[PDB]
Write a protein that binds this ligand. Structure first.
Ligand SMILES: CCCCCCCCCCCCCCCCCC(=O)OC[C@H](CO[C@@H]1O[C@H](CO[C@H]2O[C@H](CO)[C@H](O)[C@H](O)[C@H]2O)[C@H](O)[C@H](O)[C@H]1O)OC(=O)CCCCCCCCCCCCCCCCC
Ligand SMILES: CCCCCCCCCCCCCCCCCC(=O)OC[C@H](CO[C@@H]1O[C@H](CO[C@H]2O[C@H](CO)[C@H](O)[C@H](O)[C@H]2O)[C@H](O)[C@H](O)[C@H]1O)OC(=O)CCCCCCCCCCCCCCCCC
Ligand SMILES: CCCCCCCCCCCCCCCCCC(=O)OC[C@H](CO[C@@H]1O[C@H](CO[C@H]2O[C@H](CO)[C@H](O)[C@H](O)[C@H]2O)[C@H](O)[C@H](O)[C@H]1O)OC(=O)CCCCCCCCCCCCCCCCC
Ligand code: CLA
Ligand code: CLA
Ligand code: CLA
Ligand code: CLA
Ligand SMILES: CCCCCCCCCCCCCCCCCC(=O)OC[C@H](CO[C@@H]1O[C@H](CO)[C@H](O)[C@H](O)[C@H]1O)OC(=O)CCCCCCCCCCCCCCCCC
Ligand SMILES: CCCCCCCCCCCCCCCCCC(=O)OC[C@H](CO[C@@H]1O[C@H](CO)[C@H](O)[C@H](O)[C@H]1O)OC(=O)CCCCCCCCCCCCCCCCC
Ligand SMILES: CCCCCCCCCCCCCCCC(=O)OC[C@H](CO[C@@H]1O[C@H](CS(=O)(=O)O)[C@@H](O)[C@H](O)[C@H]1O)OC(=O)CCCCCCCCCCCCCCC
Ligand code: OEX
Ligand SMILES: [Cl-]
Lengths: 45, 35, 32, 102, 334, 58, 131, 231, 93, 38, 36, 57, 36
């Protein structure tokens, strides 16, 4: 049983919720600069 | 018991998704020495 | 009936913790 | 006990449960006693003697190969219980057995 | 101007919240609240649990005849073992209560919550611009809680062997652990005892040395604590005076001249001690027991001359033959 | 603080009533009975195998 | 002591200390896992206490009977052999640890088994009670 | 979920599924047969399985909820079927013939009971096994637990002449062997093999706490299966 | 139970009572274990000694072994608390 | 905002009121103790 | 004889308002003393 | 038995309990959330929420 | 079972020092308030 899933209705939230969170995160990331930097971390937000 | 299981799966997925996509959101920049 | 006393004491301890956290004396720097 | 005259499937334990063979929480025939927590064990010396309902009593009384007897007799003594000074057995044993499992 | 997710991340990682949430707190707060809720309601009103799996339930809640001391959330059934036992894996809710499912729920949520607490301590160390090794210090009690709640059940193959969520249950766990593993003779537990005793010794020593050499800043009619103002620049006590007193107490380099090295030692001794005792419990989960010195002294003929280890062995045998009544049908305890 | 009296009364009146405290009491009995013979040799405690408390004995 | 019975008639043999030490070592190496303390971890109804060895057919309270049991083990009644289940030089292919034991090794093991009932009495075969 | 369905599956896909304690019944494609008995060949009953459903306890008869998980079915019960007093009686001698299970009355209380048909001397109607024959008899239910002090109160055993006599029945753990009656009917009988299938109705007593609590009667109505072959 | 008068013969004395004792008590008598005692325990309930000598399937050599131990052997009323534990009885040392 | 509430007023209780309250409570306890106990 | 838990009623109903009055009086007296 | 708020809970619908019984004497296999215990816990949670709201205001 | 008059012990030993601390705190706060 993959991920403890025995009913196919359980897959709907497990896949769906990360999609919506990724949509919000993708709006955030599209707001960003997104070019390479030479440093230990990116100070641009 | 299935309704409780799907509610718990939804809640765990929601909070783990928030955790995962929050630490992907340039968490290293969120420090007082930035800029 | 002592279960009620135990619950009352535990709830009072938790209320003391709650008030000590959220209604604490706010720390401020003095002008010394 | 099956070979030396003792009906293992009807022997009631001290608490009314199975002393030798009992019923698993999923409904299979498993070994009784305190080893009921280890009913998920798969071993090459016991799988030929295991049906879809757990341990098959007929295959237990009929289909035992001697090498399985040797394996089970060997494994029951060198249990993974030892000490830091390499003393075998439980912590309440005397200093005569020198074994800690790899 | 910013995106909604950016504002959400700014609120989550905000230093203006009364209690810092952070991303580790996103995982920590609901897990800890779930564990706290289930623990409170199961400690007050939960039916007895068949911990040994032999259909002889043990009462642990206040409504079933327990006080604060004897009350506990009983570990799960030995029939369950270390099988995953949520509510939905039971036929009914009362079957879940009978087999000790609440113990698994509380333990899993509590371990996730304390991992989140470690991460959250790191996170608010990072947001404040301070050094992030308080979480390393907190890993030691987390290691001990994990050893007694998850690793020992993993080693012994049953969640019934984890430490009960109570006081008398904790004492029972200690006694059975001593009977079956002889933890007192285990050098890692001895290192842990040295860690806690030394931590108490060093806490009292540092507190007494600081309180002894406080710089006079108050009058006789007020507490000496008001001589220190929150946020002052100068030091509130004479470090040289305490160093001189402690150097003349034992010998002149038994003290730490450096306050930073002294505080590193303070944070190092008990953390390492608890790490070692937690790892000792983790190793005894897989039956790597403590030192066995039974019958180590014999006479010229070979008669056993007892030692203190043999009297300790007698006590361990007394605890061994009485623990888990009617759950042993075989001579050895393998 | 060896015992809670009400717990012992309820365990005596109800054989099915059991807490971890009662198990601790039984473990203490085991310690005493299996330890006193060699721990206090001046008393010359001779305990037969039938008076020694055992988990399988009951 | 170092004096154990040899024959069933009543003949006794005086054991050398080297024999006693070697028998103790071989008994702790080859028999300890099932005969720690003079008991049997796999069949607790029988043990290595002198009363169990003497009240048997044949009686195993001498050197030669113990050596014969290590060569041809039988049941407690004696009619049925247990060479498949019990280690023996007949079944050295079944139990690989027996292939190094010679007749002097069995002599030393039997001497150690007979010597222990006279050594810290009531502890040999008494189980965990006499610890 | 017949015997062919039992033998077709391996243990890898039955573990953790609950399909093992199902009391496999015969199908209608193999039913409609009969089993006869000769006057010279000895016969025995093997693989007698019983799966109880709808546990009811009188305390009127109120339905209960099961506390244990899948440890309530009996399987593999063997015993000789022996001619006695005109008919032929089934003597129970082996197999998993006991199940220590706990059920909860709808008031919060738990009543453990031992579902058993031990020492059964049941005889069944007619001299053949077909669709309609019923097997009934009386079994002997052993106590839930097996085999002098109130060590809690040393001052209770000082009262003089009457010491710890109030707490005597709880101290006196008495092994009590209650009796019960089992009535099973055979709905379908396989003719090729000695297999029969049907339902069973059981009435027995619950735990006595070794003679400390009143035994409540338990009513069990499930399904039954068994094989009749050579002895 | 608290009170049970018929328990010096469960291995506590020389005379051994059948159908109430474990198989471990037949190890005191040579030649009575693990054979013979199995026949006693399997068909447990006996009225007296002669019922054991007749209903048991004892071979002539086993009958001689029985003849060696007449006086330290008896058959009293059966107690179900000890009938259920005549093979294991929980004793292991 | 979160700060000085203008409606903050001090609360007084002089010694006469303290003694009257103590007398009232103790006399009420004396009166009603016989009825609570029975 | 005499019903129990009435000791709790009598003693708590005596103490709590007495506690309230004593606290009020001490608070008022200390405010007056700080006014000086 | 001196029940005071139980009559008012039973007056307008709440008659079952999580213990499996009803005040009419019948047995309830599936009580649902709105039992006596459910109402009591809902009131406790409502009290906590109103307490927090009072703190905020 | 549970001994009576221990309710009185627990509740009074909980209340009285709590009463003392509450009175001290309120007195100190009012003295500070009148110091202003
Ligand atoms: C909450 C989510 C957390 C997940 C943690 C689950 C606990 C891990 C576990 O129970 O671990 C055990 C499992 C092993 O599972 C066992 O696996 C066994 C597999 O054996 C089977 O297969 C074998 C094949 O030969 C044999 O045949 C054997 O007989 C047969 O049973 C059985 O299934 C057992 O029932 C099953 O328990 O490990 C695993 O899955 C892999 C190891 C996981 C990492 C181990 C966890 C370490 C503990 C955390 C460390 C804390 C340290 C402190 C940090 C601060
Ligand atoms: C503060 C607390 C700090 C910890 C203090 C512990 C360090 C003390 C020294 C170690 C104990 C000692 O006196 O060491 C003595 C033991 C030697 O043990 C001997 O072990 C023998 C093992 O015998 C076995 O093997 C023998 C083989 O001939 C025989 O067969 C015998 O029958 C059989 O039992 C004896 O039985 C006795 O146990 C004893 O004589 O050292 C050992 O076991 C060697 C391995 C243990 C090393 C220590 C563990 C490491 C812990 C480090 C933790 C950081 C500190
Ligand atoms: C910090 C100080 C640590 C040093 C301890 C002192 C060193 C010398 C003492 C010692 O060690 O003791 C001396 C022994 C050599 O002693 C021999 O050690 C043997 C070890 O037994 C091994 O062999 C036996 C048969 O040979 C059995 O098979 C037994 O099961 C098996 O363990 C027996 O005890 C012999 O009787 C004895 O003579 O050194 C050893 O073995 C050498 C072991 C050193 C390597 C250990 C590596 C760490 C292993 C992983 C530990 C996991 C840790 C988890 C936390 C705990
Ligand atoms: C931070 C949020 C959070 C997290 C992490 C968990 C975690 C867990 N809950 Mg839980 N719970 C939460 C909030 C949370 N809870 C809240 C708010 C409630 C109240 C509604 C509950 C109510 C609840 C109940 C009633 C139960 C649980 C249970 C569980 C466990 C089962 C896991 C599961 O269902 O996986 C589902 C999710 C997945 C399979 C997705 C996994 C995705 C990861 C990335 C895969 C890798 C994981 C690997 C281990 C690393 C698990 C420890 C059960 C339990 O304790 O069983 C013993 C149980 O019965 N929870
Ligand atoms: C004077 C004698 C003595 C001393 C000093 C110790 C000392 C110790 N023993 Mg020990 N022991 C002794 C005698 C002694 N023992 C005897 C005689 C026996 C035999 C009966 C034992 C048997 C024994 C066992 C069996 C075990 C110990 C363990 C321990 C260690 C405890 C670790 C601990 O609690 O901190 C670590 C901290 C924690 C466990 C707490 C976790 C905190 C979590 C992360 C957060 C909790 C938050 C909480 C839920 C909410 C707080 C409130 C909220 C409002 C904020 C410690 C070193 C244990 C050990 O080694 O550790 C694994 C252990 O398992 N002992
Ligand atoms: C209008 C107010 C009022 C009324 C009419 C009742 C009425 C009753 N109460 Mg009651 N009670 C009240 C307020 C009230 N209560 C309050 C505010 C409390 C909290 C201090 C209590 C605490 C209380 C207890 C502890 C008990 C009663 C009991 C009783 C019964 C006698 C009766 C039904 C008794 C009873 O029979 O209940 C089971 C009882 O034991 N009451
Ligand atoms: C979501 C809201 C909600 C709900 C559904 C309930 C539900 C319930 N409450 Mg409850 N309660 C609530 C909020 C709620 N409560 C709040 C916020 C409080 C704190 C004040 C309380 C305090 C409370 C107490 C103290 C008690 C209950 C009780 C009950 C139960 C019986 C109700 C009953 O008989 O009422 C009957 C209600 C009335 C007769 C009031 C009628 C309204 C008056 C007559 C209006 C008249 C003035 C009006 C303005 C007229 C002008 C308008 C007109 C022109 C139309 C029931 C389960 C009882 C119980 O069983 O306890 C568990 C009980 O004793 N509740
Ligand atoms: C990677 C770690 C970092 C991840 C970042 C996210 C943090 C997530 C926090 C963890 C919370 C998730 C809890 C779910 C775990 C759980 O028990 O699921 C429980 C589920 C099983 O679920 C159960 O499954 C049963 C199977 O018969 C039944 O179906 C039950 O109904 C069902 O509940 O397990 C999984 O989904 C496991 C997925 C694979 C994970 C294996 C890795 C774990 C071992 C390594 C970890 C230890 C080191
Ligand atoms: C459980 C609850 C039992 C009921 C007690 C209700 C709490 C009393 C109301 C709050 C009173 C308070 O905050 O003190 C308020 C007053 C203090 O007085 C306050 O002083 C302040 C100084 O910062 C300001 O001057 C305020 O204006 C003034 O009201 O305290 C009292 O003296 C009341 C004592 C109440 C007695 C408590 C014990 C009761 C038992
Ligand atoms: C068998 C050998 C191989 C295995 C053993 C390996 C040895 C381990 C220790 C060596 C590595 C660590 C070096 C010292 C640590 C350090 O941070 O140095 C920095 C300072 C050292 O002196 C400070 O040093 C400073 C100078 S400097 O910057 O460090 O160069 C100086 O400014 C300051 O005044 C001075 O106090 O730290 C300290 O003060 C702590 C010293 C003690 C810490 C190590 C000793 C172990 C203590 C017990 C361990 C806990 C057990 C508890 C169980 C109950
Ligand atoms: O429960 Mn806790 O410790 Ca695991 O081994 Mn077996 O079981 Mn019991 O003994 Mn050892
Ligand atoms: Cl066992």
């Amino acid at each position: 049983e993959a991920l403890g899933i025995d009913d196919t209705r359980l897959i709907v939230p497990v896949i769906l919720i990360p999609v919506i969170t990724f949509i919000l995160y993708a709006g955030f990331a599209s707001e960003q600069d997104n070019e390479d930097f030479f440093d230990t971390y990116d100070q641009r937000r | 018991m299935f309704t409780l299981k799907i509610v718990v799966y939804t809640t765990v997925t929601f909070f783990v998704s928030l955790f995962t996509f929050g630490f992907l959101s340039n968490d290293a920049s969120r420090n007082p020495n930035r800029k | 009936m002592e279960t009620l006393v135990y619950v009352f004491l535990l709830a009072g301890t938790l209320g003391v913790i709650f008030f000590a956290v959220f209604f604490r004396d706010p720390p401020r720097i003095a002008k010394k | 006990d099956q070979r030396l005259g003792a009906n293992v499937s009807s022997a009631q334990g001290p608490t009314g449960l199975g002393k030798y063979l009992m019923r698993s929480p999923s409904g299979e025939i498993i070994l009784g006693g305190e080893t009921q927590r280890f009913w998920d064990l798969r071993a090459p010396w016991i799988e030929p003697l295991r049906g879809p309902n757990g341990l098959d009593l007929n295959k237990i009384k009929n289909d035992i190969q001697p090498w399985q007897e040797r394996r089970a007799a060997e494994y029951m003594t060198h249990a993974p219980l030892g000490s830091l000074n390499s003393v075998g057995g439980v912590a309440t044993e005397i200093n005569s057995v020198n074994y800690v499992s790899p | 101007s910013a995106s909604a997710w950016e504002r959400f991340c700014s609120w989550i990682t905000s230093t203006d919240n009364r209690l810092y949430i952070g991303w580790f707190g996103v995982l920590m707060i609901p897990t800890l609240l779930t564990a706290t809720t289930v623990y409170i309601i199961a400690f007050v009103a939960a039916p007895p649990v068949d911990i040994d799996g032999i259909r002889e339930p043990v009462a642990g809640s206040l409504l079933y005849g327990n006080n604060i001391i004897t009350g506990a959330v009983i570990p799960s059934s030995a029939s369950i073992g270390i099988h995953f036992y949520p509510i939905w894996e039971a036929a009914s809710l009362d079957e879940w209560l009978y087999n000790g499912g609440p113990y698994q729920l509380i333990v899993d949520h509590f371990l996730l919550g304390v991992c989140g607490w470690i991460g959250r301590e790191w996170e608010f160390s990072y947001r404040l611009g301070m050094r992030p090794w308080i979480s390393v210090a907190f890993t030691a009690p987390v290691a001990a809680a994990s050893a007694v709640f998850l690793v020992y059940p993993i080693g012994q193959g049953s969640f019934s062997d984890g430490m009960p969520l109570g006081i008398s249950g904790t004492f029972n766990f200690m006694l059975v652990f001593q009977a079956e593993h002889n933890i007192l003779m285990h050098p890692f537990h001895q290192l842990g005892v040295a860690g806690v005793f030394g931590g108490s010794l060093f806490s009292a020593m540092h507190g007494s040395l600081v309180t002894s050499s406080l710089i006079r800043e108050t009058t006789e009619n007020e507490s000496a604590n008001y001589g220190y103002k929150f946020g002052q620049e100068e030091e509130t006590y004479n470090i040289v005076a305490a160093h001189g007193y402690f150097g003349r107490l034992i010998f002149q380099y038994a003290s730490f001249n450096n306050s930073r090295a002294l505080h590193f030692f303070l944070g190092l001794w008990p953390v390492v001690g608890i790490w070692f005792t937690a790892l000792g419990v983790m190793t005894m989960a897989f039956n790597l027991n403590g030192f066995n010195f039974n019958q180590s002294v014999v006479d010229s003929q070979g008669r056993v001359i007892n030692t203190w280890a043999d009297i300790l062995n007698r006590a361990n045998l007394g605890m061994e033959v009485m623990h888990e009544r009617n759950a042993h049908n075989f001579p050895l305890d393998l | 603080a060896y015992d809670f009296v009400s717990q012992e009364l309820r365990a005596a009146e109800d054989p099915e009533f059991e807490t971890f405290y009662t198990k601790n009491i039984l473990l203490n009995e085991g310690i005493r009975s299996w330890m006193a013979a060699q721990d206090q040799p001046h008393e010359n405690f001779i305990f037969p195998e039938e008076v020694l408390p055992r988990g399988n004995a009951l | 002591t170092r004096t154990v019975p040899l024959d069933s008639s009543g003949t006794t043999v005086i054991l050398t200390p080297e024999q006693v030490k070697r028998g103790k070592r071989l008994f702790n190496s080859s028999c300890g896992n099932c005969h720690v303390g003079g008991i049997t971890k796999t069949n607790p109804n029988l043990g290595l206490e002198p009363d169990a060895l003497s009240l048997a057919t044949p009686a195993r309270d001498n050197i030669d009977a113990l050596v014969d049991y290590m060569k041809n083990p039988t049941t407690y009644d004696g009619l049925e052999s247990i060479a498949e289940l019990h280690p023996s030089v007949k079944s050295a292919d079944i139990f690989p640890k027996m292939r190094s034991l010679s007749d002097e090794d069995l002599f030393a093991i039997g001497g150690h088994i007979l010597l222990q009932p006279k050594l810290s009495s009531e502890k040999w075969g008494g189980g965990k009670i006499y610890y | 979920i017949t015997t062919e369905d039992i033998r077709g599956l391996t243990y890898s896909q039955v573990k953790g599924t609950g399909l093992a304690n199902r009391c496999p019944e015969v199908s209608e494609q193999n039913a409609g047969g009969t089993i006869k008995f000769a006057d010279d060949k000895k016969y025995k009953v093997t693989e007698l399985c019983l799966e109880p459903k709808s546990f009811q306890i009188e305390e009127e008869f109120v339905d209960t909820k099961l506390m244990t998980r899948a440890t309530y079915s009996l399987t593999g019960i063997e015993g000789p079927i022996v001619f006695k007093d005109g008919g032929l009686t089934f003597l129970e001698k082996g197999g998993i013939d006991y199940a220590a299970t706990t059920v909860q009355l709808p008031g919060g209380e738990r009543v453990p009971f031992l579902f058993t048909i031990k020492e059964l001397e049941g005889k069944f109607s007619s001299s053949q096994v077909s669709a309609g024959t019923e097997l009934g008899g009386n079994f002997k239910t052993p106590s839930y637990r097996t085999g002098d002090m109130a060590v809690a109160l040393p001052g209770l055993e000082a009262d003089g002449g009457e010491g710890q006599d109030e707490l005597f029945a709880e101290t006196n753990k008495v092994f009590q062997v209650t009796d019960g009656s089992i009535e099973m009917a055979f709905n379908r009988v396989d003719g090729t093999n000695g297999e029969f299938s049907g339902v069973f109705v059981s009435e027995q007593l619950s735990d006595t706490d070794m003679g400390s609590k009143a035994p409540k009667k338990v009513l069990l109505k499930g399904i039954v299966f068994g094989k009749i072959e050579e002895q | 139970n608290v009170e049970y008068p018929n328990v010096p013969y469960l291995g506590g004395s020389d005379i051994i009572d059948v159908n109430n004792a474990n198989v471990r008590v037949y190890t005191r008598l040579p030649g009575m274990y693990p054979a013979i005692a199995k026949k006693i325990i399997k068909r447990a309930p006996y009225k007296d000694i002669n019922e054991m000598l007749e209903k048991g399937d004892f071979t002539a050599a086993e009958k001689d072994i029985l003849d060696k131990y007449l006086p330290n052997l008896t058959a009293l009323e059966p107690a179900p608390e000890y009938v259920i534990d005549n093979i294991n009885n929980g004793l292991y040392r | 905002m979160s700060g000085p509430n203008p409606n903050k007023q001090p609360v007084e209780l002089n010694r006469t009121s303290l003694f009257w309250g103590l007398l009232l409570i103790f006399v009420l306890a004396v009166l009603f103790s016989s009825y609570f106990f029975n | 004889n005499v019903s129990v838990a009435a000791y709790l009623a009598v003693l708590l109903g005596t103490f709590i308002p007495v506690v309230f009055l004593l606290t009020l009086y001490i608070q008022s007296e200390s405010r007056k003393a700080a006014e000086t | 038995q001196g029940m005071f708020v139980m009559p008012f809970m039973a007056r307008i619908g709440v008659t079952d309990s999580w213990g499996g019984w009803s005040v009419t004497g019948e047995s309830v296999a599936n009580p649902g959330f709105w039992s006596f215990e459910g109402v009591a816990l809902a009131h406790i949670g409502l009290s906590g929420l109103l307490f927090l709201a009072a703190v905020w205001h």
